[PDB]
């Protein structure tokens, strides 16, 4: 169970880190318009 | 943020005053701090800059190596009683178990302090005689202070502006590590416990567990 | 006792970490994502 | 050897390429060591040479002088008030006072303030005559660092060759004596036994009786 | 609010004995671990976040 | 006259037995008795930095010596005006008393308990003060770095440069005497554990036995 | 700098822009004096002669009331924390030496010395000292000198000086030679003086109402904010609760 807990914990913090740094990676510049 | 030239930030900010003329601002970390005039001439400045940067790298390695093993001791790596506390780590070689890297008996497991010092003398003497001279079996012409080449495997030091910015990061991180190494040396003597132990005592009750509790402990008493 | 459990419920357990390796891998994984993000800068 | 472009170096083959340009080997004991670089100024370098020279000589006096009481306690059983040098001063605080070789009628000194006053005035007048380079014609000359006149009775100052290698021998023996003097000083604070006593205890078992055996003595509590 | 709890009459405590009363707060928990362990705490049963 | 203190005809750091003194010491600065056998100030601007150090230290040590003596002079017969902290090297712990640090025996004076607050207030105030000293501020922006003399001399004093120079010689000789004294206070405190005034009174009781000679056996190794 | 916030046509008035158009100010206060907020509901100013003549009395009242504010707040506080003052409270300090009971002077930090001279000597030298000073003030005639700013000045310096601002002998530390900073400090002085005048009149009415000193007022108010204020003191005794 502890091995499963460490596995789910690293999976969740990996995906949440992807979300955090993806929205930090200049997101208001992804528009297809002018401005 | 203009880390070079006359418009660089100085060691007192808005109240800095006119920096010394030899500290023009062409070298990394130039905060215009030479109040004792040690580097008026170029040669003392070059030698002192070498002492700076060599000490900076030695202190970065030192600060990480003082922080790491006692952190791992708190993590479950089994250092018994003195391999955790940095200033007592050297005393670990005399115990019946020897000196075990990461607490495992299969790792290192050293018993001869004379042998480990002798191997270190020949290795570091060759390395430092090579560093001073600027020649080795495989490298011919390299900067004595910023060598590179085989010392830059990742190609990180290529383009001059990134090189200079990383030099500023190097010198400032090194100065911070030198400051913390002075801190480790002083808190070792006056408290008698590890640096992270000092931190966790300061994290429990900072209002009383600080450096002011250990001020009266060195009063010479008749 | 008849069977082995974590018994991590309650206790005000920060981030739900009962062993330090959990906090270490959380910090380490956020650090790896930050490392790739940071080195992959000065782009676009 | 010891002079000119192929002089000996403080790192040997490792001091071939990076050497200071101010260390040209005109002076005895020159090996090229200014890694910290405290002598980029020429007259400042001259002042440090003066410091190094008489420092070496004073160290030679100390190094020979703090072996002889303990060596004489060894072998032919010479008795003292106290033989070990770092506890020699308390000899003057004993009941029998200070005696040169244990004889009550050798010097028998008890007035420590008076001997301090005598030593201060005599060595002060000696040093003042040294630094001034003589006055009113009484030795009112010489280089004040290698005098020779009225200080070299054996006359081993001629033959500029022999003077050069003898000067190198002087500074090099002095540097050995300074290194030894730091040995005596640090063994005094760490071991608390005489230099010869530490060498005697050293010959029994070097494996367990090294400097690491007292490496845990100064562990903070 | 801190000043009101420390020197301006105290605040109402239901955990004081006798049914609770208005008590003057003495020695608040300034421990950072106790303060931020509530924040880092899970919101679910047994922990309830803050 | 003033020639005793300036020019080649001045007094010397070894008197009539000093001709080989150093040639960069022309006799244009206060003090300057010719004592530079180490030769550290042969460099001109490092010499300038060293004079700045000299005068700043001189002023600080005049204040320090007169402050290390003045509480122990103002101590009374029963010892109720000040507690045990009338001795200078135990003054700081006076802020750890339940009555706090009170400037005299009356609790109406200062009455400070927060050493952290006192340290932070001192750091901020002294930072602004020394930044004004190095760069310039309300008290001056282009005055002399060592002798500003426009708000720092409100009682006139520094007129008629003939008297001004010899008064500066008084500054530097009083200062150097003070730093010699402060070195005395430190080395007396570390080897006795007694206040400087009681060192003086114990010596005035018995000068043959009450001297550092009696304390020369204190640091002996076992 | 920033002297266009106290002088000129654009300056801080006694009301902001919405409640006071700039044309509502008296014409004789258009930013020529330090502390000109255009505050004149009742026409006492008339014109510039009467304005500067009243400013003379305003400035003297200010320079008295500021020292007064310090002299009422300081020794009462010193006695309250434990100095040996015996009469720090201002409305009963005079009652100490009615029967020869001379006051104790605190030369802080080296003070608490007894003043060995009685009320008759106090008042005789007080009139002969400040009467001499005030006769000097209207005449601009001063006998001797030795001021720190200019040492041992003769009597031929007070003539030609500006009345109500006599720089030189009365300026030991200078810091007013720049007219810019001198004007800024004039505004600072007159505003501090008006503040202290309000403060000392508040001290008076607070003493008349509460029967105690203003340092006691601020200390008890900081101890119990709602339990000690004006509406608390005029209650007399408690309050019937509304339960
Ligand atoms: C006429 C002879 C004359 C002589 C010999 C000296 C000698 C000296 N002057 Mg003086 N002066 C003289 C005339 C004059 N001086 C001055 C004005 C000054 C000033 C203003 C100053 C001196 C200073 C000095 C000293 C500089 C050298 C030094 O530091 O040595 C080092 C000294 C020694 C190595 C002697 C050590 C003796 C030893 C017995 C000490 C005790 C040892 C302990 C028992 C153990 C200690 C170590 C242990 C703990 C391990 C020195 C002692 C300077 C100084 O150093 O002041 C403090 C200084 O600032 N002189 C004037 C007036 C213009 C003079 C006029 O004639
Ligand atoms: C030049 C300044 C200075 C000096 C010399 C001292 C010295 C001392 N303080 Mg103090 N302090 C100083 C400044 C300050 N202190 C405090 C606040 C306190 C407190 C709260 C306490 C002390 C205490 C002590 C004593 C510690 C006991 C002891 O024997 O320690 C070792 C010291 C000696 C054996 C004396 C000889 C000193 C010498 C070896 C060192 C001189 C060189 C310095 C390293 C120079 C450092 C320069 C600075 C700018 C980095 C000690 C003599 C404690 C005390 O009195 O306990 C009874 C105490 O409780 N200090 C503040 C904040 C307001 C300071 C601000 O500047
Ligand atoms: C270079 C000179 C020199 C040195 C190194 C020493 C060293 C010593 N003497 Mg000393 N002395 C010296 C000169 C003189 N002594 C005396 C008179 C006495 C007496 C009467 C006594 C001593 C004692 C001592 C010891 C101090 C006690 C102790 O354990 O301290 C701590 C010791 C150490 C930390 C180790 C050794 C110190 C060394 C590393 C420091 C060297 C510092 C300087 C570089 C030396 C030069 C300083 C000045 C002169 C320029 C110590 C080992 C005492 C003793 O032995 O009691 C048992 C004692 O009673 N001395 C006189 C006057 C005649 C001297 C010179 O004129
Ligand atoms: C300049 C303003 C001034 C003010 C506002 C007061 C105000 C006061 N004095 Mg006073 N005095 C003043 C100046 C002076 N007094 C005195 C001498 C006295 C005495 C001797 C007494 C007062 C008393 C009083 C109080 C009762 C009336 C009262 C609050 C009386 C008091 O304290 O009653 C409680 C009282 O007995 N005053 C002298 C010296 C002659 C003064 C000189 O300027
Ligand atoms: C991660 C974020 C997840 C948020 C939802 C998860 C469930 C949160 C929850 O368990 O909620 C309840 C918690 C409190 O938990 C309770 O906390 C209580 C704490 O009380 C204890 O402690 C108290 C101390 O005074 C008392 O003494 C009390 O009597 C004692 O029992 C008990 O332990 C309960 O068992 C426990 O369930 O609230 C909280 O943490 C407050 C935090 C916000 C919760 C918001 C719920 C709604 C969330 C989103 C709605 C948005 C929808 C938008 C999109 C559509
Ligand atoms: C967030 C609130 C706020 C802000 C940012 C402003 C800002 C401004 N007001 Mg204004 N005003 C406010 C609220 C506010 N007002 C309220 C509540 C009132 C009714 C009393 C007024 C009535 C008012 C008038 C009549 C005028 C202005 C004017 C102005 C302008 C400049 C002059 C000035 O300082 O006014 C002065 C305002 C005061 C002197 C009120 C006293 C403010 C002090 C400093 C109170 C200290 C605050 C303290 C923390 C209490 C807050 C408690 C809080 C918990 C509720 C300026 C841009 C002027 C203007 O319009 O220019 C053309 C003008 O004529 N205001
Ligand atoms: C709609 C709006 C949002 C709605 C509701 C928000 C309300 C409150 C938000 C704060 C709640 C508390 C925050 C800390 C929660 C926490 O640390 O959980 C930690 C908990 C603790 O987990 C458990 O703890 C127990 C004891 O505390 C035991 O130890 C268990 O073993 C352990 O698993 O785990 C989780 O809840 C999983 C968190 C995963 C989060 C994924 C979503 C994040 C997405 C984006 C983040 C962006 C930035
Ligand atoms: C149980 C423990 C888990 C608790 C999670 C919280 C841990 C504490 C982190 C709080 C830091 C606050 C981040 C605010 C700025 C982030 C925006 C950014 O990123 O801005 C990005 C910006 C871009 O230039 O850079 C920058 O400003 C520099 C970024 C500063 C962030 C410092 C990170 C600390 C060390 C990272 C991991 C140690 C790495 C080890 C793993 C690596 C592989 C082994
Ligand atoms: C700039 C200036 C200018 C002005 O004017 C003048 C002046 C003052 C001169 C100046 C300043 C200066 C300074 C600041 C200095 C300082 C320094 C330092 C601190 C160093 C350290 C430095 C430090 C260092 C190197 C450190 C190092 C460390 C090390 C190696 C360590 C090691 C180790 C480890 C890992 C762990 C184990 O278990 C133990 C050991 C083995 C032990
Ligand atoms: C070159 C260089 C270059 C780079 O770059 C930089 C640097 C690093 C800086 C450098 C180096 C330097 C060095 C090495 C130094 C060292 C020195 C020494 C060791 C000294 C001693 C020195 C030492 C000495 C003098 C000593 C002396 C001694 C004595 C007197 C003694 C006395 C005594 C006696 C007899 C007897 C009695 O019973 C005791 C006593 C009293 C005790
Ligand atoms: C010239 C020459 C030349 C040749 O060639 C070479 C050589 C040898 C290098 C030379 C010499 C040099 C010298 C002599 C030096 C010395 C110095 C000093 C001693 C300083 C002090 C200096 C000193 C000082 C600043 C001091 C200061 C002090 C202070 C702050 C104090 C404070 C205090 C007090 C009040 C009291 C209380 O309760 C405590 C406290 C709070 C703590």
Distance of alpha carbon B23 from alpha carbon B8, whole angstroms = 11
Find the distance separating the first CA and the last CA of chain D, reported in whole Å.
Answer: 52
Taking the C-alpha atoms of residue G90 and residue C19, their distance in angstroms, rounded to an integer, is 68
Answer yes or no: are the C-beta atoms of B37 and F50 closer than 8 Å: yes
Nearest ligand 11 atom to the CA of F71 is 38
Residues G216, G80: contact at Cβ < 8 Å? yes
Closest by alpha carbon to E33, among B67, C12, A13, B72? C12
Q: How far is B70 from chain E (nearest CA, A)?
A: 21
**Closest to G5 measured CA to CA, from G182, G176, G189, G183:** G183
C-alpha Rg value of chain G to the nearest Å: 23
- Omega before A15 cis (within 30°)? no
Pocket of ligand 1 (CB under 6 A): D 119-120, 124, 128; F 11-15, 17, 33, 35, 180
CA-nearest residue to B41 within chain F is F43
Residues near ligand 3 (Cβ within 6 A): D 86-90, 92, 112, 115-116, 119, 185, 188-189; F 216-217, 219-220
Torsion on CA atoms G195, G197, G200, G206, rounded to nearest 10: -80
Bridge pairing between strands F101-102 and G113-114: unpaired
- Reported resolution, Å: 3.6
Rounded to 5 degrees, φ, ψ at D87 are -120, 25
Q: Which long-range contacts (CB under 8 A, 24 or more apart) does D176-184 make?
A: D177/D56, D177/D59, D177/D60, D177/D62, D177/D63, D177/D64, D178/D55, D178/D56, D178/D59, D180/D59, D180/D63, D181/D59, D181/D62, D181/D63, D184/D62, D184/D63, D184/D66, D184/D85
Round to whole Å and give the CA distance between B85 and B82: 5
Backbone angles phi, psi at G113, to 5 degrees: -100, 140
Encoded tokens for D205: 């078992």
Q: Is the CB of E12 under 6 A from ligand 5?
A: no
Q: Secondary structure of B98-166 in the HEC alphabet?
A: CEEHHHCCCCEEECCHHHHHHHHHHHHHHHHHHHHHCCECCECCCCCCCCCHHHCCCCCCCCHHHHHHH
Q: Please tell me the total number of residues recorded for chain C in this structure.
A: 44
How far apart CA B103 and CA B126 sit, in angstroms, is: 30
Ligand 4 pocket, mutate which of G94, G103, G210 (most atoms under 8 A from CB)? G94
Check CB contact under 8 Å for E32 and B205: no
Give the H or E element holding residue E13.
strand E11-13
Closest CA to B170 of B57, B84, B11: B57
Centroid of ligand 8 to alpha carbon of C33 (angstroms): 10
Q: If you compute the radius of gyration of chain E from its CA atoms, what whole number of angstroms results?
A: 14
Chains C, E in contact, 3 or more Cβ pairs below 8 Å: yes
Atom 18 (ligand 1): residue with closest C-alpha?
Answer: F13
Q: Which residues pair with B99 in a beta bridge?
A: B110
Query: How far off is chain G from F34, nearest CA to CA, in Å?
Result: 37
Q: Please tell me the distance between residue G46's alpha carbon and the centre of ligand 5 in angstroms.
A: 72
Query: What are the CA-CA distances from residue D82 to residues A27, D112, D194, D200 (Å)?
Result: 84, 17, 11, 18
Superfamily of structural domain G48-235: Chlorophyll a/b binding protein domain (1.10.3460.10)
- Total residues belonging to chain B: 222
Confirm or reject contact between C29 and chain A (CB < 8 A): yes
Question: What tokens were used for G39?
Answer: 């505050």
How many contiguous H segments (helices) and E segments (strands) does chain C have? 1, 0
DSSP output for chain F: -GGGTSSTTS--SSGGG-SS------S-SSS--S--TT-TT-SHHHHHHHHHHHHHHHHHHHHHHHHHHHHHHH--SSS-SS-GGGSGGG-GGGGGSTT-EESSSSTTSEEE--HHHHHHHHHHHHHHHHHHHHT-BTTBSSS-SS---SSS-TT----SHHHHHHHHHHHHHHHHHHHHHHHHHHHHHHHH-S-HHHHHHHHHH-TTTSSTTTTTTTT---
In whole angstroms, what is the distance from residue G13 CA to residue G38 CA? 6
Contact flag F155-G148 (C-beta cutoff 8 Å): yes
Ligand closest to E49 (CA) is: 5
DSSP category for residue E2? H
Tell me whether B155 touches chain C (CB under 8 Å).
no
Helical residues (DSSP H) of chain C, grouped into ranges = 20-39
How far apart are the C-alpha atoms of A6 and G73, rounded to whole Å?
67
C-alpha closest to that of B71 among B194, B202, B206, B177: B194
User: Nearest-CA distance from E9 to chain G in Å?
Assistant: 8
On whether the F2-215 domain is CATH 1.10.3460.10, my answer is: yes
- Cβ neighbours of residue G100 under 8 Å, at least 6 residues apart? G118, G119
Tokens of F92: 């700081």
CB atoms E47 and C13 under 8 Å: yes
Nearest by CB to residue C33, choosing from A9, A17, A29, is A17
- Other beta carbons within 10 Å of B12: 17
Distance B37 CA to ligand 9 centre (A): 20
Residue D115: name the closest of D89, D96, D136, D140 by CA. D89
Q: Can you spell out the DSSP letters for chain D?
A: --SSTT---SSGGGGSS---TT--S-STT-----SS----SHHHHHHHHHHHHHHHHHHHHHHHHTTHHHHHHSSS----S---GGG-GGGGGSSS-B-SSS-TTT--B--HHHHHHHHHHHHHHHHHHHHHT-BTTBT--S-SSS--TTT-TT-TT-SHHHHHHHHHHHHHHHHHHHHHHHHHHHHHHHT-S-HHHHHHHHHH-TTTSSGGGGTTTT---
CA distance D46 to D84: 37
Q: Does domain B13-214 have CATH number 3.40.50.10800?
A: no
Q: G80 near G211, Cβ under 8 Å? A: no
List the one residue out of B45, B43, B18 whose CA is nearest residue B32: B18
Residues 9-28 of A with CB under 8 A from C: 9-10, 13-14, 17-18, 20-21, 24-26
Q: Does G229 touch chain E (CB under 8 A)?
A: no
Q: b/e string for F21-60 if b means 16 or more Cβ within 10 A?
A: bbeebeeebbbbbbebeebbbbbeebbbbebbebbebbee
Report F:29-88 residues touching D (Cβ under 8 A).
Answer: 36-40, 42-43
User: Contact F118/G92 with Cβ under 8 angstroms?
Assistant: no
Residue D173 known to bind ligand: yes
HSE at residue G186, side-chain half, CA atoms within 13 A, is 22
Nearest CA in chain G to E7: G223
Q: Tell me the sheet residues that pair with G104.
A: G114
At residue B108, what are phi and psi to the nearest 5 degrees? 55, -80
Instruction: Tell me if G210 sits within 8 A of G34, measured CB to CB.
Output: no
Q: Are G232 and G226 in contact (CB under 8 A)?
A: yes
Domain D12-214 has CATH 3.40.50.300: no
* Rounded Cα–Cα distance for residues D207 and B45 (Å): 44
Q: In this structure, are residues B113 and B95 in contact, taking their beta carbons and an 8 Å threshold? A: no
Number of neighbouring beta carbons within 10 Å of residue B166: 13
Task: Enter the DSSP assignment of G46.
Answer: -
Contact call for G109 and F156, based on CB within 8 A: no
Domain limits, chain G: 48-235
Q: How many CA atoms lie within 13 A of F73 on its CB side?
A: 6
Residue B44 vs residues B16, B26, D146, F62, F190: alpha-carbon distances, Å? 24, 16, 29, 33, 36
Query: Which residues of chain G does F111 touch, with a Cβ-Cβ cutoff of 8 Å?
Result: 81
How far CA D218 is from CA of B186, B188, D190, F217, G9, in Å, comes to 14, 11, 9, 21, 77
* Cβ E39 vs Cβ E50: under 8 Å: yes
Contacts B200 to E, Cβ<8 Å: none
Q: Which residues of C are less than 8 Å from A25 in CB distance?
A: 37
- With 0-12 / 13-18 / 19 or more C-beta atoms within 10 angstroms meaning exposed / middle / buried, residue D20 is middle
Alpha carbon B172 to its chain centroid, in Å, reads 11
Of residues F47, F92, F190, nearest to B215 (C-beta): F92
Residue F110 — φ and ψ, nearest 5°?
60, -80
CA distances from E50 to D170, E6, E46, F150 (A): 79, 22, 12, 60
Chain E residues in contact with B205 by the CB 8 A cut-off are: 31
- Non-local (6+) Cβ contacts of G6 within 8 A are G12, G31, G34, G35, G36, G183, G184, G187
Alpha-carbon gap, residue G164 to F210, rounded angstroms: 65
Pairing of strands B108-110, E11-13: unpaired
Q: Which chains form contacts with chain A, at 3 or more CB pairs under 8 Å? A: C
Find the residue in E nearest to B201 (Cα): E31
Which contiguous run of DSSP H or E holds residue E23? strand E21-23
Pairwise CA distance, residues G204 & G207, whole Å: 5
Chains B, D: CB contacts under 8 A, how many? Answer: 61
CA atoms within 13 A on the CB side of D107: 15
Task: Please tell me the number of Cα atoms within 13 Å of F109 on its side-chain side.
Answer: 16
* Distance, CA of F98 to CA of G216 (rounded, Å): 24
- Nearest residue of E to residue B206, measured between CA atoms: E31
Location of structure tokens 């991590």: C8
Burial category of B85 from C-beta neighbours within 10 Å (exposed 0-12, middle 13-18, buried 19 and up): buried
- Cα separation, F170 vs F100, in Å, equals 39
E47 vs C contacts (CB less than 8 Å): 10-13
């Amino acid at each position: 169970m502890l091995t499963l807990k460490i596995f789910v914990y690293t999976v969740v913090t990996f995906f949440v880190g992807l979300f955090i740094f993806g929205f930090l990676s200049n997101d208001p510049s992804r528009n297809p318009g002018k401005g | 943020s203009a880390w070079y030239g006359p418009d660089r930030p100085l060691f007192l900010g808005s109240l800095s005053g006119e920096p010394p003329s030899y500290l023009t601002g062409e070298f990394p970390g130039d905060y215009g701090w030479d109040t004792a005039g040690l580097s008026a001439d170029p040669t003392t400045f070059a030698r002192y800059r070498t002492i700076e940067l060599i000490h900076a790298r030695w202190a970065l390695l030192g600060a990480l190596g003082i922080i790491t093993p006692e952190l791992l001791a708190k993590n479950g790596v089994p250092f018994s009683e003195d391999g955790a506390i940095w200033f007592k780590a050297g005393a670990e070689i005399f115990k019946e178990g020897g000196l075990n890297y990461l607490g495992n008996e299969n790792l290192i497991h050293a018993q001869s302090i004379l042998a480990t010092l002798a191997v270190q003398v020949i290795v570091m003497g060759a390395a430092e005689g090579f560093r001073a001279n600027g020649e080795a079996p495989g490298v011919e012409g390299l900067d004595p202070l910023y060598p590179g080449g085989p010392f830059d495997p990742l190609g990180l030091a290529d383009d001059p502006e990134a090189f200079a910015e990383l030099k500023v990061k190097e010198i400032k991180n090194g100065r911070l590590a030198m400051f913390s190494c002075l801190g480790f040396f002083v808190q070792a003597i006056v408290t008698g416990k590890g640096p992270i132990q000092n931190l966790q005592d300061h994290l429990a009750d900072p209002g009383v567990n600080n450096a002011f509790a250990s001020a009266t402990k060195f009063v010479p008493t008749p | 006792l008849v069977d082995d459990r974590m018994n991590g419920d309650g206790t005000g357990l920060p981030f739900g970490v009962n062993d330090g390796i959990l906090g270490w891998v959380i910090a380490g994984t956020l650090g790896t994502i930050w490392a790739i993000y940071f080195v992959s800068q000065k782009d676009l | 050897e010891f002079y000119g472009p192929d002089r000996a170096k403080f790192l040997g083959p490792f001091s071939e390429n990076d050497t200071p340009e101010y260390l040209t080997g005109e002076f005895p004991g020159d090996y090229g060591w200014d890694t910290a670089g405290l002598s980029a100024d020429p007259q400042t370098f001259a002042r440090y040479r003066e410091i190094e020279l008489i420092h070496a000589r004073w160290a030679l006096l100390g190094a020979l002088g703090i072996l002889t009481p303990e060596l004489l306690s060894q072998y032919a059983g010479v008795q003292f008030g106290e033989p070990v040098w770092f506890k020699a001063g308390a000899q003057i605080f004993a009941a029998g006072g200070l005696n040169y070789l244990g004889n009550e009628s050798l010097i028998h000194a008890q007035s420590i303030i008076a001997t301090l006053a005598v030593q201060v005035v005599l060595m002060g007048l000696a040093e003042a005559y040294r630094a001034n380079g003589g006055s009113e014609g009484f030795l009112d000359d010489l280089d004040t660092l290698y005098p020779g006149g009225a200080f070299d009775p054996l006359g081993l100052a001629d033959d500029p060759d022999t003077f050069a290698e003898l000067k190198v021998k002087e500074i090099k023996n002095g540097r050995l004596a300074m290194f030894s003097c730091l040995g005596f000083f640090v063994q005094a604070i760490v071991t608390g036994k005489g230099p010869v006593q530490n060498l005697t205890d050293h010959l029994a078992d070097p494996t367990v009786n090294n400097a690491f055996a007292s490496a845990t003595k100064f562990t903070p509590g | 609010l801190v000043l009101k709890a420390l020197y301006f009459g105290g605040v109402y405590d239901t955990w004081a004995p006798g049914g609770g009363d208005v008590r003057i707060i003495s020695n608040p928990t300034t421990n950072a671990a106790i303060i931020f362990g509530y924040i880092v705490k899970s919101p679910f049963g047994g922990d309830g976040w803050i | 006259t003033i020639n005793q203190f300036y020019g080649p005809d001045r007094n010397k750091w070894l008197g009539p037995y000093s001709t080989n003194t150093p040639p960069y010491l022309t006799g244009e600065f206060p003090g300057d008795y010719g004592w530079d056998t180490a030769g550290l100030s042969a460099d001109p601007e490092t010499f300038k930095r060293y004079r700045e150090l000299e005068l700043i230290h001189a002023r600080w040590a005049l204040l320090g010596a007169l402050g290390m003596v003045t509480p122990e002079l103002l101590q009374d017969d029963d010892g109720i005006m000040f507690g045990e902290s009338a001795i200078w090297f135990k003054a700081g712990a006076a802020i750890f008393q339940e009555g706090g640090l009170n400037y005299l025996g009356n609790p109406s004076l200062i009455h400070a308990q927060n050493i952290v607050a006192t340290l932070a207030v001192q750091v901020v105030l002294m930072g602004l003060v020394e930044g004004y000293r190095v760069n310039g501020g309300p008290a001056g922006e282009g005055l002399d770095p060592l002798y500003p003399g426009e708000a720092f001399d409100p009682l006139g004093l520094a007129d008629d440069p003939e008297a001004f120079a010899e008064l500066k010689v008084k500054e530097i000789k009083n200062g150097r005497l003070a730093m010699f004294a402060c070195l005395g206070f430190f080395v007396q405190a570390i080897v006795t554990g007694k206040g400087p005034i009681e060192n003086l009174t114990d010596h005035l009781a018995n000068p043959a036995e009450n001297n550092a000679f009696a304390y020369a056996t204190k640091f002996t190794p076992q | 700098p920033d002297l266009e916030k106290w002088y000129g046509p654009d300056r801080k008035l006694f009301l902001p822009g919405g409640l006071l158009d700039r044309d509502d100010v008296p014409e004789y206060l258009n930013g020529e004096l330090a502390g000109d907020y255009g505050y004149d509901p009742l026409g006492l100013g008339k014109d510039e002669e009467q304005v500067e003549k009243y400013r003379a009395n305003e400035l003297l009242h200010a320079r008295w009331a500021m020292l007064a504010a310090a002299g009422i707040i300081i020794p009462e506080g010193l006695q309250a924390n434990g100095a040996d003052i015996k009469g720090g409270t201002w409305f009963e300090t005079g009652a100490e030496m009615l029967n020869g009971g001379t006051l104790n002077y605190f030369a802080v930090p080296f003070g608490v010395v007894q003043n060995p001279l009685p009320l008759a000597a106090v008042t005789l030298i007080e009139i002969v000292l400040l009467g001499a000073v005030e006769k000097f003030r209207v005449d601009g005639t001063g006998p001797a000198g030795f001021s720190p700013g200019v040492g041992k000045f003769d009597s031929d310096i007070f003539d030609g000086l500006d009345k109500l601002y006599p720089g030189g002998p009365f300026d030991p530390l200078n810091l007013a030679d720049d007219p810019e900073v001198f004007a800024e400090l004039q505004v600072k002085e007159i505003k501090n003086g008006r503040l202290a005048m309000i403060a000392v009149l508040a001290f008076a009415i607070q003493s008349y109402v509460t029967g105690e000193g203003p340092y006691a007022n601020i200390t008890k108010h900081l101890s119990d904010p709602f339990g000690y204020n004006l509406l608390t003191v005029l209650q007399g005794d408690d309050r019937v609760p509304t339960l």
